Design a protein around this ligand. Structure first.
Ligand code: MG
Ligand code: MG
Ligand code: MG
Ligand code: MG
Ligand code: MG
Ligand code: MG
Ligand code: MG
Ligand code: MG
Ligand code: MG
Ligand code: MG
Ligand code: MG
Ligand code: MG
Ligand code: MG
Ligand code: MG
Ligand code: MG
Ligand code: MG
Ligand code: MG
Ligand code: MG
Ligand code: MG
Ligand code: MG
Ligand code: MG
Ligand code: MG
Ligand code: MG
Ligand code: MG
Ligand code: MG
Ligand code: MG
Ligand code: MG
Ligand code: MG
Ligand code: MG
Ligand code: MG
Ligand code: MG
Ligand code: MG
Ligand code: MG
Ligand code: MG
Ligand code: MG
Ligand code: MG
Ligand code: MG
Ligand code: MG
Ligand code: MG
Ligand code: MG
Ligand code: MG
Ligand code: MG
Ligand code: MG
Ligand code: MG
Ligand code: MG
Ligand code: MG
Ligand code: MG
Ligand code: MG
Ligand code: MG
Ligand code: MG
Ligand code: MG
Ligand code: MG
Ligand code: MG
Ligand code: MG
Ligand code: MG
Ligand code: MG
Ligand code: MG
Ligand code: MG
Ligand code: MG
Ligand code: MG
Ligand code: MG
Ligand code: MG
Ligand code: MG
Ligand code: MG
Ligand code: MG
Ligand code: MG
Ligand code: MG
Ligand code: MG
Ligand code: MG
Ligand code: MG
Ligand code: MG
Ligand code: MG
Ligand code: MG
Ligand code: MG
Ligand code: MG
Ligand code: MG
Ligand code: MG
Ligand code: MG
Ligand code: MG
Ligand code: MG
Ligand code: MG
Ligand code: MG
Ligand code: MG
Ligand code: MG
Ligand code: MG
Ligand code: MG
Ligand code: MG
Ligand code: MG
Ligand code: MG
Ligand code: MG
Ligand code: MG
Ligand code: MG
Ligand code: MG
Ligand code: MG
Ligand code: MG
Ligand code: MG
Ligand code: MG
Ligand code: MG
Ligand code: ZN
Ligand code: ZN
Lengths: 53, 69, 110, 77, 141, 181
RNA sequence: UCCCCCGUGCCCAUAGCGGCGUGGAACCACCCGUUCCCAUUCCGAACACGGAAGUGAAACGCGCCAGCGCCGAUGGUACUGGGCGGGCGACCGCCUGGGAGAGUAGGUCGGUGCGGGGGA
RNA sequence: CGCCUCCUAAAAGGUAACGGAGGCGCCCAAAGGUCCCCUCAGGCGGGACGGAAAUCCGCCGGAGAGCGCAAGGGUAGAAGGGGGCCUGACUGCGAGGCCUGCAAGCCGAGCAGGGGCGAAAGCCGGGCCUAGUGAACCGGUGGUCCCGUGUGGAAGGGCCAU
RNA sequence: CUGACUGGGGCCUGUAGAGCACUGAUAGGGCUAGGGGGCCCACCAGCCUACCAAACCCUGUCAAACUCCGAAGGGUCCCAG
């Protein structure tokens, strides 16, 4: 991690809970991450979005 | 072949300046060229185009014999 | 110095053996198509099926499917149900795919 | 006068943890190593750090297949 | 004088001097030889002194073959420092020499000349030596 | 397959003359053309106007086949070369297309070379293949002055089943490749 | 049960490189095609399909040859577990048990299982 | 001054010195998963601009190349190179072990939930591996809706995540 | 009865020694790019070298951080005393 390589949380888009922490490079990957993840709240995979740590 | 990336090959006539005509294939049906194997010097036996000289120089000057012995 | 063929062949066979199943191996010549179901623990073939041995006919694909069903038949009769498909150096497609679908209809489990 | 040297890293305790003939249980670590000095053989898994371990309860066996490398097997009991 | 043009490492641990020569035990180029009777680190300077004396005996003529080479770096702490604070600096290079080694050979020169040169050269070496001449045993190795 | 004159010339005139000249005991032993591989080593497109879609077009007209791009194996300083950079084209002519190309190369292109005094007798492999380099692409009947932005040459490999230079010469010469000496 | 070939394994070069020879009935390949399935960062080269006129040229299979490669004793030695001596030292020896590496002689142009197909 | 790699280290493990040499305090949205395909450096020969080295063709070439970075081990029967689809860079756990004074560190089959790739066998709980790190205390933020000082709330806390 | 130690058996190892196949070092010779120098030139190629010398080869060596090899021993488990 660095000023450019940041930590971020992934929020389930259906129930709004942050379910995963991970990291990315914001120079290489400026758009907010969107990833399908398993939401344990929703009990199903859900598109999760990068939301600020 | 893969579709949509390759120019078609069709029967094509290449016409040279000698008046030669070639039955071949191309991406263009009719082509006119200024030279070919039928009329090119190097090809045409050894057609010594413009310079059939035999050097001509320089022993071969000969003007003349009029200096005396 | 191996060839793309020798490599491809190893690479898929290696993965298949790793899983420990009986292996349905497939040879595909210009004309025919053969099938051994092999036990690699013992180094042994347990059931065979060939277009050569079945003196089978014409369209290679249709033929494949036939050896396919043929193999499964002698196979279930020996108690063999499950098995792993060894596409050898061959893309799973064409005659091989056809052979595979045939051993499937035939009741082979994979 | 002084030294630009002076450091070293912790030992990693690598190597075989169970030798041929030894009775193991499912999960037992058999080999600890860097890269594939021994390859997983019959009933032997390999973890992400090349660690070899028993897949079943059984007995360890080593096998040297020449150019194919060396192999750790576990033979069921 | 003799030293490596390059090395992977600047300093070498000291090691030991047990045993007879590993090889280098038979005459292999010239006619007469100088063999080490006892082990030592032979210094580059000592080697060069041995050589020079031999060419000096020959004046003009002969061939000298040098069969030992100083690739071992010799280290020493600066004067008067105390123990610790790192390893000494390289001060020279030695060639490790265990008993039996043919260190030098000469060829193309009379016997009385090869004898005397190797004797004088011997006096420059910090070990006991014997002069040998090529036998069949040399030729059979 | 197409009836193309040079192809036929091979089977009719060259085939037999060769069997005469070297006395083959086998139909397959006699020299065949295998492939003609044309390459534009380019890299005049490294950065600049790395639109050599222009050249890929030109080659596609000449050979009737769309070249594929080549890119640098390693990064190189003095040529200004970062690894992965598009520096060349390569179109691999086989079969009918190979013949059609060679036909026009021999009949029309080589004639149109400036001060053409014959192909090089020494450009032979030693395993019996031939290579030859062009300076311009205006040589081909398909590419007019009007349509070209800048002069670019190419490398032509002609690959034979011959085992020896000496045999491969006969094949290409008989097909009509003009050699200077 | 023997011979040839096609698959697939095992031993892991005594199996390899090279030179020579040989095989197409069968099988295998190359081969003929590129409509069709499928395919080329271009290419029916590959992969893939449909084929059966040809050829064993390539590949492959099987033989033969020791130039290279690989294998390699016996003998002796180095070294050494244990036990003893000597030397001021660098170091050196004896006993008992183990015993290389190099090298020499020599060996090798593979051996073998399973299933198919063909032959006697 | 912590951490990694090699040597010292006496062929298990471990092993010191202000002994001999080098690295780390990152990174990668692909440089991750899976399916499919591909194979190197280098040498000789041949080929316009074009050179020791750009790209192309031929032969030889088992790995000396590659693998983000030090070293080592590993590795083409791929861990290397290319492409397609993807987010397992899972959630709930976890048999059994490695290591080990503690606390840490490490590996992990399997079952369940919901997925990815694959025809399938199957693989996938980040990365060929070993560095890329920091206990507890105090506090922040999202969630939960567990406690709530007579009672209902609220304040404040707990719990899960960071 | 499981111990130290010992007997037998399997597996693990990279040291002593040795080697040079790898990484490097290395004397000499051979062969041969490359330079230096001398003939002969600037018309661009030649030729000669008891000079320095790459790669390769032969002879002969060196290495804690080299290993194609490689012990004696050591470790561990099983049976037994
Ligand atoms: Mg996480
Ligand atoms: Mg310092
Ligand atoms: Mg240190
Ligand atoms: Mg430690
Ligand atoms: Mg330590
Ligand atoms: Mg360490
Ligand atoms: Mg071990
Ligand atoms: Mg794993
Ligand atoms: Mg990994
Ligand atoms: Mg065994
Ligand atoms: Mg077993
Ligand atoms: Mg010391
Ligand atoms: Mg001294
Ligand atoms: Mg010292
Ligand atoms: Mg000191
Ligand atoms: Mg010192
Ligand atoms: Mg000194
Ligand atoms: Mg010595
Ligand atoms: Mg003296
Ligand atoms: Mg010797
Ligand atoms: Mg030539
Ligand atoms: Mg050829
Ligand atoms: Mg034109
Ligand atoms: Mg076979
Ligand atoms: Mg067999
Ligand atoms: Mg077997
Ligand atoms: Mg024949
Ligand atoms: Mg043959
Ligand atoms: Mg036939
Ligand atoms: Mg016939
Ligand atoms: Mg046909
Ligand atoms: Mg079509
Ligand atoms: Mg149709
Ligand atoms: Mg084809
Ligand atoms: Mg043949
Ligand atoms: Mg084949
Ligand atoms: Mg013989
Ligand atoms: Mg030997
Ligand atoms: Mg012996
Ligand atoms: Mg003894
Ligand atoms: Mg002792
Ligand atoms: Mg003894
Ligand atoms: Mg030994
Ligand atoms: Mg021996
Ligand atoms: Mg052989
Ligand atoms: Mg059989
Ligand atoms: Mg039979
Ligand atoms: Mg730290
Ligand atoms: Mg150690
Ligand atoms: Mg060690
Ligand atoms: Mg150790
Ligand atoms: Mg030890
Ligand atoms: Mg331990
Ligand atoms: Mg530092
Ligand atoms: Mg990609
Ligand atoms: Mg990867
Ligand atoms: Mg991918
Ligand atoms: Mg190359
Ligand atoms: Mg070249
Ligand atoms: Mg040029
Ligand atoms: Mg070039
Ligand atoms: Mg490497
Ligand atoms: Mg670095
Ligand atoms: Mg999808
Ligand atoms: Mg536990
Ligand atoms: Mg613990
Ligand atoms: Mg699944
Ligand atoms: Mg599941
Ligand atoms: Mg599916
Ligand atoms: Mg798992
Ligand atoms: Mg990686
Ligand atoms: Mg990492
Ligand atoms: Mg406190
Ligand atoms: Mg405190
Ligand atoms: Mg708190
Ligand atoms: Mg209240
Ligand atoms: Mg409440
Ligand atoms: Mg109150
Ligand atoms: Mg109220
Ligand atoms: Mg209430
Ligand atoms: Mg409220
Ligand atoms: Mg609250
Ligand atoms: Mg709360
Ligand atoms: Mg918590
Ligand atoms: Mg939780
Ligand atoms: Mg007892
Ligand atoms: Mg016990
Ligand atoms: Mg005990
Ligand atoms: Mg014992
Ligand atoms: Mg030693
Ligand atoms: Mg060496
Ligand atoms: Mg040798
Ligand atoms: Mg030593
Ligand atoms: Mg060491
Ligand atoms: Mg060593
Ligand atoms: Mg023991
Ligand atoms: Mg033991
Ligand atoms: Mg007992
Ligand atoms: Zn949710
Ligand atoms: Zn004309």
């Amino acid at each position: 991690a660095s000023e450019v390589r940041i930590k971020l949380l992934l929020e389930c888009t259906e129930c709004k809970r942050r379910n995963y922490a991970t990291e990315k490079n914001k120079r290489n990957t400026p758009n907010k991450l969107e990833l399908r993840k398993y939401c344990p709240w929703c009990r199903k995979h859900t598109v999760h979005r990068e939301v600020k740590i | 072949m893969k579709e949509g990336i390759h120019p078609k090959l069709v029967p094509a006539r290449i016409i040279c300046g000698c008046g030669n005509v070639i039955e071949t294939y191309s991406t263009k049906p009719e082509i006119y060229v200024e030279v070919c194997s039928k009329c090119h010097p190097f090809y045409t036996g050894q057609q010594r185009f413009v310079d059939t000289e035999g050097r001509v120089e320089r022993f071969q000057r000969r003007y003349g014999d009029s200096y005396r012995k | 110095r191996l060839t793309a063929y020798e490599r491809r062949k190893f690479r898929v066979r290696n993965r298949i053996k790793r899983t420990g199943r009986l292996r349905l191996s497939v040879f595909r010549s210009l004309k025919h198509i053969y099938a051994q179901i092999i036990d690699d623990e013992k180094g042994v073939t347990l059931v065979s099926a060939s277009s050569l041995a079945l003196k089978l006919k014409g369209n290679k694909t249709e033929v494949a499917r036939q050896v396919g069903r043929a193999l499964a038949e002698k196979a279930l009769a020996l108690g063999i149900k499950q098995v792993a498909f060894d596409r050898g150096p061959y893309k799973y497609h064409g005659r091989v795919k056809a052979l595979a679908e045939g051993a499937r209809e035939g009741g082979l489990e994979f | 006068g002084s030294t630009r040297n002076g450091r070293d890293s912790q030992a990693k305790r690598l190597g075989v943890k169970r030798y041929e003939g030894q009775v193991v249980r499912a999960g037992n670590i058999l080999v600890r190593q860097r890269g594939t000095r021994f390859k997983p053989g019959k009933n032997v898994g390999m973890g992400r750090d090349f660690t070899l371990f028993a897949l079943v309860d059984g007995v360890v066996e080593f096998q040297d297949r020449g150019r194919l490398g060396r192999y750790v097997h576990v033979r069921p009991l | 004088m003799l030293m490596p043009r390059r090395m992977k490492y600047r300093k070498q641990q000291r090691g030991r001097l047990k045993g007879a020569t590993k090889g280098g035990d038979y005459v292999a180029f010239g006619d007469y030889g100088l063999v080490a009777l006892e082990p030592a680190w032979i210094t580059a300077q000592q080697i060069e002194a041995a050589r020079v004396a031999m060419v000096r005996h020959f004046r003009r003529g002969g061939k000298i073959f040098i069969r030992i080479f100083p690739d071992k770096p010799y280290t020493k702490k600066p004067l008067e420092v105390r123990m610790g604070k790192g390893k000494g600096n390289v001060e020279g290079y030695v060639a490790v020499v265990k008993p039996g080694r043919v260190m030098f050979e000469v060829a193309g020169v009379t016997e009385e000349q090869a004898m005397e040169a190797l004797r004088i050269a011997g006096h420059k070496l910090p070990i006991k030596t014997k002069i040998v001449r090529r036998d069949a045993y040399d030729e059979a190795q | 397959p197409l009836d193309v004159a040079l192809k036929r010339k091979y089977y009719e005139e060259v085939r037999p003359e060769l069997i005469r000249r070297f006395g083959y005991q086998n139909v397959w032993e006699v020299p065949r053309l295998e492939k003609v591989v044309i390459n534009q080593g380019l890299g005049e497109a490294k950065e600049d106007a790395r639109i050599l879609e222009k050249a890929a077009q030109e080659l596609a007209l000449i050979t009737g086949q769309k070249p594929a791009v080549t890119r640098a194996k390693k990064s190189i300083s003095n040529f200004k070369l970062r690894k992965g950079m598009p520096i060349g084209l390569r179109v691999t002519l086989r079969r009918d297309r190979m013949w059609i190309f060679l036909e026009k190369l021999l009949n029309v292109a080589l004639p149109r070379i400036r001060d053409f005094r014959g192909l090089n007798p020494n450009s032979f492999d030693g395993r019996g293949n031939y290579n030859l380099g062009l300076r311009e692409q205006l040589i081909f009947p398909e590419i007019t002055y009007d349509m070209v932005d800048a002069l670019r040459g190419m490398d032509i490999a002609v690959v034979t089943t011959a085992e020896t230079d000496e045999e491969a010469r006969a094949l290409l010469e008989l097909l009509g490749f003009p050699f200077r000496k």
